[PDB]
Design a protein around this nucleic acid. Structure first.
Ligand SMILES: [Mg+2]
Ligand SMILES: [Mg+2]
Ligand SMILES: [Mg+2]
Ligand SMILES: [Mg+2]
Ligand SMILES: [Mg+2]
Ligand SMILES: [Mg+2]
Ligand SMILES: [Mg+2]
Ligand SMILES: [Mg+2]
Ligand SMILES: [Mg+2]
Ligand SMILES: [Mg+2]
Ligand SMILES: [Mg+2]
Ligand SMILES: [Mg+2]
Ligand SMILES: [Mg+2]
Ligand SMILES: [Mg+2]
Ligand SMILES: [Mg+2]
Ligand SMILES: [Mg+2]
Ligand SMILES: [Mg+2]
Ligand SMILES: [Mg+2]
Ligand SMILES: [Mg+2]
Ligand SMILES: [Mg+2]
Ligand SMILES: [Mg+2]
Ligand SMILES: [Mg+2]
Ligand SMILES: [Mg+2]
Ligand SMILES: [Mg+2]
Ligand SMILES: [Mg+2]
Ligand SMILES: [Mg+2]
Ligand SMILES: [Mg+2]
Ligand SMILES: [Mg+2]
Ligand SMILES: [Mg+2]
Ligand SMILES: [Mg+2]
Ligand SMILES: [Mg+2]
Ligand SMILES: [Mg+2]
Ligand SMILES: [Mg+2]
Ligand SMILES: [Mg+2]
Ligand SMILES: [Mg+2]
Ligand SMILES: [Mg+2]
Ligand SMILES: [Mg+2]
Ligand SMILES: [Mg+2]
Ligand SMILES: [Mg+2]
Ligand SMILES: [Mg+2]
Ligand SMILES: [Mg+2]
Ligand SMILES: [Zn+2]
Lengths: 142, 53, 47, 110, 116, 101
RNA sequence: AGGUUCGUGGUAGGAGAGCGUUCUAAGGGCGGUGAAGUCAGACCGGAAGGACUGGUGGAGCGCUUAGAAGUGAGAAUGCCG
RNA sequence: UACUCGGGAGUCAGACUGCGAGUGAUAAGAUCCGUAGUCGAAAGGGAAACAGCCCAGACCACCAGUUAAGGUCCCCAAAUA
RNA sequence: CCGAUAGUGAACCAGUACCGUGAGGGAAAGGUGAAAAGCACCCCGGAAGGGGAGUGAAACAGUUCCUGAAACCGUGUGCCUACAAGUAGUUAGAGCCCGUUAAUGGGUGAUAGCGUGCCUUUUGUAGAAUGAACCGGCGAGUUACGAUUUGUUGCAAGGUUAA
């Protein structure tokens, strides 16, 4: 009958900067995934990308509670016999904070073509400066 | 040893993508104006390198 | 002779089995499954 | 405007003739004749005779310019098949298909 | 007399095969796999006539939630407040109003907020 | 200016001059139909009903009484020799909106 | 004919009402200004199914009420092409 | 509803779960009884997937509403109550 | 009663061809047109085969010749497709292209949700249990005479004939 459906390129998409200092990995990840999907707008359409772009700074200061710094593990398999590799969360926070944030965010996005499209709108920096001043991003508070 | 399933039309047409053949390497004869292969004697006048053969 | 109508209830239509499952007498034709009584010419004596 | 020629029930398998007929389509007739002459396949003489027959009856029946023709369409169709047998081991026989084909070529201007 | 089986088999099978237009390969050409595909399509359509209504209700609820969060509310609080105020506008109308005429949506949100 | 009205067991948003398809109503073609279950009137002033706006009506004209495009309902159960086929044709009334009062 | 109430998942299986095919009888029709068959369509009926329009075809075929059956196929490592 | 008389049957391989017993080792998705349920012959919702567990019995249509078990940070509808 | 897979095995040079040492077993195969008027002549080609011209109502009836379905093989083109994990559909849905037995119309479909063929046999099968390469034709509760029960009709303390 008569219900609204958004068209590609119709809803204007914004740029946001989020500071990651002292926030738990999962809490920030949930909010950022919800923003990327586009679920904060009434023009949300399940088969169209209506979300926004997100910049994250200070990713080296994300928070881990309990003993997650030494006891939480990330695994990879190369598909070769016996090729499993292991890596703890804390020393990724020290060495590759961007990979840590990207893995956490990716785990809670939809698993299809559209989800892989949405993953490309996220930019993560471990320091306090980014390269996207020409996009004029805006501060967003969790 | 034996095909488990029959092959569909699309799969057969995809496999037959490269089973075409090429186009001969020919050009016109400076003497008689006929077509001929490069580095070969002209079969219409018996010329090569501008000489009778 | 172009308007013949027999007395109602005097004639009924025959039942035919083994003619599809929409009739209720399809595959096994009212016989059930796998016995002596499911076979052609099967069954036992009168007593 | 157009002329055509057909060769019917030619004793050659349709695939082996199609592989050659593919590379004549949409070409100027003199270039097409040259292409057929220098392709060392067994289907080239048959297609050459069909194409020259089409050019000839274009010239004769319709008074068209024989120097401005192109090959409009060319194709191969299946004809009837001769059924043969080959004796194999153990006393058994296997089927053989001697296939034939109809070959059609059309020429026109521009 | 003898009845030979002509002209009915072809008619029935052709009808089935035409019902399968647009399917992949043999499924739009051959009767035996077309028959199966047509049965499967009918069953799927029967089930999806039920699933369509609940999918649309999910979409309306998500849109209303997004609209109400901008007015410092939740979907659950807003719906409870609209119940308390005697307002009987359903999800379809509320989501339509949210996307197209947000001012009336804010009016209704104020009414619900006062009802709480 | 528009309204939200209740008919056919559901609700519809309505403007003037708009063509509408609803569940079958009583009335010959050309008669005038009045809806009195008005929930909301919008445009430059919002009248919110609790649950209906008092004294408000909408008037429309009957264009046709029809049945919708045919649909086939089919069911089967695998390996149980069970199939069932049916046809459906849902009736409707078409109207044009005369006025919102 | 109209109401009121209670119902309407289904295998083996019981009961009912029908669709379509060939032939016969009577009535009444169509058809070289084009029959049957065949091809294509976005039409109609609750189902089995039934029309209409155009191409091909080139001589026979529907409808109504009855009657009689070599009476409807997707599967049998089925038979023939 | 029950019963009596008459026409037509199919069934005689059952499974799991809770409770009460035997056999077994106070094993078995074991075996054999009693008692109730579901499957068989039952789709829909929840247990990730999952005949037999939990909720609940599909005449057809709708882009309407309220609830059950189960749930309300993201995947994924609803409390970062 | 059949109408060319039917009716004789045999509608056609059929107990023939073919198989077997032999006794013996045992096929396939109908249709130009009303009338041969069965295409003089020209052109390409060794021919076959074509393109004209002519005959005919028709040659897209041209000596396996009425009609001419499907599988299967091709040529052309409107829409989609080279970051994607697919029982191939269905529901939602842009964009592009059309224009009907005219009606809340047709083709194709980026992307999103849901979704383990059909049959048989089983307590239980998507089943790694069975069967089917595909398309077409053929292919399974009948008849006779008795018994019993239900319905219908005629006559009724009677009813009914067999040869
Ligand atoms: Mg992890
Ligand atoms: Mg009778
Ligand atoms: Mg009957
Ligand atoms: Mg098709
Ligand atoms: Mg398609
Ligand atoms: Mg529903
Ligand atoms: Mg099955
Ligand atoms: Mg009946
Ligand atoms: Mg019929
Ligand atoms: Mg007559
Ligand atoms: Mg037809
Ligand atoms: Mg047809
Ligand atoms: Mg058709
Ligand atoms: Mg004709
Ligand atoms: Mg009889
Ligand atoms: Mg018969
Ligand atoms: Mg028969
Ligand atoms: Mg069948
Ligand atoms: Mg057999
Ligand atoms: Mg066979
Ligand atoms: Mg044959
Ligand atoms: Mg065969
Ligand atoms: Mg059993
Ligand atoms: Mg079962
Ligand atoms: Mg379930
Ligand atoms: Mg709290
Ligand atoms: Mg015949
Ligand atoms: Mg003749
Ligand atoms: Mg004749
Ligand atoms: Mg010559
Ligand atoms: Mg000749
Ligand atoms: Mg013809
Ligand atoms: Mg003819
Ligand atoms: Mg044809
Ligand atoms: Mg064909
Ligand atoms: Mg194309
Ligand atoms: Mg990638
Ligand atoms: Mg479209
Ligand atoms: Mg695109
Ligand atoms: Mg078994
Ligand atoms: Mg087959
Ligand atoms: Zn030369």
């Amino acid at each position: 009958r008569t219900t609204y459906m958004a068209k590609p390129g119709e809803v204007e998409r914004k740029w946001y900067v989020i500071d990651a200092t002292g926030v738990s990995l999962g809490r920030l990840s949930s909010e950022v995934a919800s923003i990327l999907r586009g679920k904060n707008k009434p023009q949300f359409t399940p088969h169209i990308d209506t979300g926004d772009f997100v910049i994250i700074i200070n990713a080296g200061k994300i928070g881990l509670t309990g003993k997650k710094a030494t006891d939480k593990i990330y695994y990879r398999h190369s598909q070769y016999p016996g090729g499993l590799k292991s890596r703890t969360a804390g020393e990724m926070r020290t060495n590759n904070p961007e990979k840590l944030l990207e893995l956490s965010i990716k785990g809670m996005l939809p698993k299809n073509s559209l989800g892989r499209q949405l993953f490309k709108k996220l930019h993560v920096y471990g320091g306090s400066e980014h390269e996207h001043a020409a996009q004029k991003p805006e501060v967003y508070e969790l | 040893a034996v095909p488990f399933r029959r092959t569909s039309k699309a799969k057969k047409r995809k496999r037959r993508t490269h089973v075409k053949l090429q186009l001969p390497g020919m050009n016109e004869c400076s003497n008689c104006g006929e077509y001929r292969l490069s580095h070969h004697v002209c079969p219409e006048c018996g010329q090569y390198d501008g000489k009778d053969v | 002779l172009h308007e013949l109508k027999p007395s109602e209830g005097s004639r009924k239509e025959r039942n035919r089995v083994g003619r599809g499952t929409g009739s209720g007498n399809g595959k096994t034709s009212g016989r059930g499954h796998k016995g002596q009584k499911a076979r052609s010419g099967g069954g036992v004596r009168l007593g | 405007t157009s002329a055509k020629a057909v060769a019917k029930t030619v004793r050659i398998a349709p695939r082996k003739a199609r592989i050659v007929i593919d590379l004549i389509r949409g070409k100027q007739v003199g270039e097409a004749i040259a292409i057929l002459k220098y392709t060392p396949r067994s289907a080239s003489p048959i297609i050459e005779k069909v194409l020259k027959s089409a050019i000839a009856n274009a010239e004769h029946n319709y008074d068209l310019d024989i120097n401005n023709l192109v090959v409009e369409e060319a194709f191969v169709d299946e004809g009837p098949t001769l059924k043969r047998f080959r004796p194999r081991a153990q006393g058994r026989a296997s089927a053989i298909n001697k296939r034939t084909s109809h070959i059609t070529v059309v020429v026109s201007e521009v | 007399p003898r009845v030979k089986g002509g002209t009915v088999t072809r008619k029935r099978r052709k009808k089935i095969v035409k019902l399968a237009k647009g399917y992949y390969g043999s499924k739009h050409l051959l009767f035996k796999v077309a028959n199966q595909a047509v049965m499967k399509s009918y069953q799927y359509a029967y089930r999806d006539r039920r699933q369509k209504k609940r999918d649309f209700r999910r979409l309306w609820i998500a849109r209303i939630n997004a609209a109400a969060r901008m007015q410092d509310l939740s979907y659950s609080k807003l719906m409870h407040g609209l119940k308390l105020a005697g307002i009987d506008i359903n999800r379809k109308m509320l989501a339509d109003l949210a996307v197209n005429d947000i001012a009336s949506f804010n009016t209704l949100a104020d009414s619900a907020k006062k009802a709480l | 200016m528009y309204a939200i009205i209740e008919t056919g067991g559901k609700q519809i948003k309505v403007e003037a001059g708009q063509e509408i398809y609803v569940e079958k109503l009583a009335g010959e073609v050309g008669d005038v139909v009045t809806f009195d279950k008005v929930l909301f009137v919008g445009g430059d002033s919002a009248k919110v009903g609790v649950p209906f706006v008092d004294g408000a009506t909408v008037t429309a004209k009957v264009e046709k009484q029809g049945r919708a495009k045919k649909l086939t309902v089919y069911k089967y159960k695998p390996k149980k020799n069970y199939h069932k086929k049916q046809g459906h044709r849902q009736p409707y009334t078409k109207l044009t909106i005369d006025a919102i009062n």
